[PDB]
Design a protein around this nucleic acid. Structure first.
Ligand SMILES: [Mg+2]
Ligand SMILES: [Mg+2]
Ligand SMILES: [Mg+2]
Ligand SMILES: [Mg+2]
Ligand SMILES: [Mg+2]
Ligand SMILES: [Mg+2]
Ligand SMILES: [Mg+2]
Ligand SMILES: [Mg+2]
Ligand SMILES: [Mg+2]
Ligand SMILES: [Mg+2]
Ligand SMILES: [Mg+2]
Ligand SMILES: [Mg+2]
Ligand SMILES: [Mg+2]
Ligand SMILES: [Mg+2]
Ligand SMILES: [Mg+2]
Ligand SMILES: [Mg+2]
Ligand SMILES: [Mg+2]
Ligand SMILES: [Mg+2]
Ligand SMILES: [Mg+2]
Ligand SMILES: [Mg+2]
Ligand SMILES: [Mg+2]
Ligand SMILES: [Mg+2]
Ligand SMILES: [Mg+2]
Ligand SMILES: [Mg+2]
Ligand SMILES: [Mg+2]
Ligand SMILES: [Mg+2]
Ligand SMILES: [Mg+2]
Ligand SMILES: [Mg+2]
Ligand SMILES: [Mg+2]
Ligand SMILES: [Mg+2]
Ligand SMILES: [Mg+2]
Ligand SMILES: [Mg+2]
Ligand SMILES: [Mg+2]
Ligand SMILES: [Mg+2]
Ligand SMILES: [Mg+2]
Ligand SMILES: [Mg+2]
Ligand SMILES: [Mg+2]
Ligand SMILES: [Mg+2]
Ligand SMILES: [Mg+2]
Ligand SMILES: [Mg+2]
Ligand SMILES: [Mg+2]
Ligand SMILES: [Mg+2]
Ligand SMILES: [Mg+2]
Ligand SMILES: [Mg+2]
Ligand SMILES: [Mg+2]
Ligand SMILES: [Mg+2]
Lengths: 103, 117, 142, 55, 110
RNA sequence: AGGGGAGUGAAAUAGAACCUGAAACCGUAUGCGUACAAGCAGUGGGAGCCUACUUGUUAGGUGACUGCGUACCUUUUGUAU
RNA sequence: GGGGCUCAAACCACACACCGAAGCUGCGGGUGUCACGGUGACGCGGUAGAGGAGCGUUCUGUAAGCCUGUGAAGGUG
């Protein structure tokens, strides 16, 4: 039992009881969410290929935490032109746990 | 008010020499050489965040080609067939099924084939 | 959900035997180099050798088109002044028939430690038989 | 003639990989158990079971 | 046990003294004393007196037996150097450094 | 000469070249890598091995193999030069 | 550019597909200006140079305060 879902402009292959980090969602911690845009559900030997979205399929999850990724450092340097610039970045994410896959 | 530079200058040199850890020879232990090495390392890292996305699409596309020709289809004919029917599955997800879930990849290639492409 | 990468300790390799009995040299050599590199498998990764073993048996019966049997030259330098030496396709077939196929395939492979490793899996012979019966190569039609 | 670049730490240590010292052939006199150089009179003045110089 | 003995300011360069220290590292003191007695190097005469001091330290302060000892640690560090002036041709003056070293020997029965 | 103990001292790695004791530079010990391999020495990817504990969607150390990649300042129409 | 290429892997027409940039779109963030009362809109490569806003060092007031041998400054992780 696994599914392919779309969230945050990316696609994720998903199995039940899995932890994965996705782009930040506007959901409070501990709240349940569902994913209606399911592209593929495969149940052992049975594979439902989704004409664009598999009809009736839905993948539920609960929000575990919010956080930020490790800092990356940006530098812009133009040699012998007297120019330099620095910047920092930490990207937000939401961690969700997949509770149930409805085929 | 005479200001001495000893403490501040030492704190600034140690920040650079800590980023130069693991470099070869003088690039990890003298400030003048380690300063240039840290700058060039950050120049490379900025450019390689763009190239990471290019190197991974090329890897997915090459693996999809290998899996499609095992089912009697080329990469360019499979992509046209997928777009003809419905499918919006990524090259990233497609390359994962080609290696791990081979029975699901065959079903998709067979459906793309049935769109006469 | 990271991308799969092959591991050199857990790669499956097969043995194949290819007969060069009237095949064009460069169009046979491109098929060989494709399989030495592992480009025909979904497990292919750019930094590990996932390819197969190729045995080539009738290496002296490979052919070229046009006027290339006498007009195609192989040059090499010995490192001494004036040490440039040449031989054509017709004469090299007579002397070292296997060197013709190896030179073509070797130029179609990467020039690095990994490329020299894939080249070690190519066995070229000039008979109709090979010494690798215990490996039981399967037939490959061009 | 002189260098255009200074040698690295690693480069000069490779030149010294042939600077190690070897040992000598030492023997023990059967009569007295005294160590000496092979084929040499011992510091006590013995050689091949005989007194040669007696200091 | 691991009793040590040190010689600070030995009048020899550290690079010259380290050639002899590589010969005795990890050996039994009896077989390393014979090696130093028959060496043609000047650093062997200096380092043989340090090793004999470390053996004498173990017998008096620790009650060790020389026949069960072996040299476990030996290293040569740099000492302070003297600075002298050497006249060269055409009025040029050169600067000489006279280097010294610190020699440490450790013996152990275990 | 210099040391190993013993003593004095709150403290001798405060021992007289004596408060603190940084960096360049030189060593010893342990872990991983390195003797078919070509270039500003890094970075994107990445196996294996070692250590720690939460025994692996973890942390630390190494980095086989591979894609890209000719230092910095000044002066210039223009510099890997 | 090399290997190699001859009913081409050359050339001349036509057709359909795909790859391919830091371009465009998607998702998540930060900022400048203008309008309205936090939203909308379009901007955000840069040398000489102009404009705006900040960090840190020593000393003086706040301070006859507060911290500190149950451990200050400094050094090193
Ligand atoms: Mg000052
Ligand atoms: Mg390193
Ligand atoms: Mg690309
Ligand atoms: Mg791409
Ligand atoms: Mg010279
Ligand atoms: Mg030189
Ligand atoms: Mg120079
Ligand atoms: Mg010069
Ligand atoms: Mg020069
Ligand atoms: Mg030498
Ligand atoms: Mg004179
Ligand atoms: Mg000198
Ligand atoms: Mg006391
Ligand atoms: Mg102290
Ligand atoms: Mg003190
Ligand atoms: Mg004091
Ligand atoms: Mg002191
Ligand atoms: Mg220091
Ligand atoms: Mg060393
Ligand atoms: Mg090797
Ligand atoms: Mg070779
Ligand atoms: Mg070299
Ligand atoms: Mg080369
Ligand atoms: Mg990585
Ligand atoms: Mg690690
Ligand atoms: Mg690397
Ligand atoms: Mg590399
Ligand atoms: Mg380059
Ligand atoms: Mg390159
Ligand atoms: Mg200059
Ligand atoms: Mg000029
Ligand atoms: Mg000029
Ligand atoms: Mg001009
Ligand atoms: Mg240029
Ligand atoms: Mg230069
Ligand atoms: Mg090329
Ligand atoms: Mg045609
Ligand atoms: Mg197109
Ligand atoms: Mg892109
Ligand atoms: Mg843009
Ligand atoms: Mg956006
Ligand atoms: Mg722009
Ligand atoms: Mg700007
Ligand atoms: Mg004040
Ligand atoms: Mg304390
Ligand atoms: Mg102060």
């Amino acid at each position: 039992m696994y599914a392919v879902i779309v969230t945050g402009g990316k696609q994720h292959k998903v199995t039940e009881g899995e932890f994965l980090k996705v782009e930040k969602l506007d959901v409070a911690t501990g709240e349940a969410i569902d994913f209606d845009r399911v592209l593929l559900v495969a149940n052992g030997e049975d594979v439902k290929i989704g004409l664009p979205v598999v009809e009736g399929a839905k993948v539920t999850a609960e929000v575990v935490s919010h956080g930020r990724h490790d800092k990356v450092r940006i530098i812009k340097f133009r040699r012998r032109k007297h120019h330099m610039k620095r910047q920092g970045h930490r990207q937000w994410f939401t961690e969700i746990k997949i509770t149930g896959i409805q085929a | 008010a005479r200001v001495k530079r000893g403490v501040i200058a030492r704190r600034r040199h140690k920040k650079i020499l800590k980023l130069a850890k693991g470099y070869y020879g003088a690039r990890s232990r003298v400030f003048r050489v380690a300063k240039q090495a840290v700058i060039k390392a950050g120049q490379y890292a900025y450019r390689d965040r763009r190239q990471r996305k290019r190197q991974f699409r090329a890897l997915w596309i090459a693996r999809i080609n290998a899996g499609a020709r095992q089912n009697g289809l080329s990469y360019s004919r499979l992509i046209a067939g997928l777009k003809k029917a419905a499918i919006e599955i990524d090259r990233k997800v497609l390359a994962d099924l080609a290696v791990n879930e081979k029975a699901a990849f065959t079903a998709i290639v067979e459906k793309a084939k049935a769109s006469l492409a | 959900m990271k991308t799969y990468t092959a591991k050199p300790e857990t790669v499956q390799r097969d043995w194949f035997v290819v007969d060069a009995a009237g095949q064009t040299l460069g169009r046979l050599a491109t098929e060989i180099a494709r399989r030495l590199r592992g480009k025909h498998k979904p497990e292919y990764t750019p930094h590990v050798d996932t390819g197969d073993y190729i045995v080539v048996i009738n290496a002296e019966q490979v052919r070229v088109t046009g006027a290339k049997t006498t007009d195609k030259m192989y040059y090499h330098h010995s490192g001494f002044p004036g040490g440039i030496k040449s031989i054509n396709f017709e004469k090299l077939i007579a002397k070292a028939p296997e060197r013709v196929i190896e030179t073509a395939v070797k130029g179609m492979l990467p020039k690095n430690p990994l490329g020299r490793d894939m080249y070690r899996k190519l066995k070229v012979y000039k008979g109709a038989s090979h010494p690798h019966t215990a490996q039981q190569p399967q037939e490959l039609k061009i | 003639a002189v260098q255009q670049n200074k040698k690295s730490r690693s480069a000069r240590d490779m030149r010294r990989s042939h600077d190690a010292l070897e040992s000598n052939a030492l023997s023990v006199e059967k009569s007295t158990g005294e160590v000496h150089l092979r084929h040499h009179v011992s510091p006590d003045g013995f050689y091949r079971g005989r007194k040669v110089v007696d200091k | 046990m691991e009793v040590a003995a040190k010689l600070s300011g030995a009048r020899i360069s550290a690079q010259k003294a380290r050639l002899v220290a590589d010969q005795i590292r990890g050996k039994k003191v009896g077989e390393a004393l014979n090696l130093l007695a028959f060496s043609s190097k000047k650093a062997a005469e200096i380092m043989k007196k340090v090793l004999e001091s470390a053996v004498a330290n173990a017998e008096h302060n620790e009650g060790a037996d020389v026949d069960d000892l072996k040299v476990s640690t030996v290293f040569v560090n740099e000492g302070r150097s003297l600075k002298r002036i050497m006249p060269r041709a055409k009025g040029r003056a050169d600067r000489i450094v006279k280097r010294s070293c610190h020699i440490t020997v450790k013996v152990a029965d275990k």
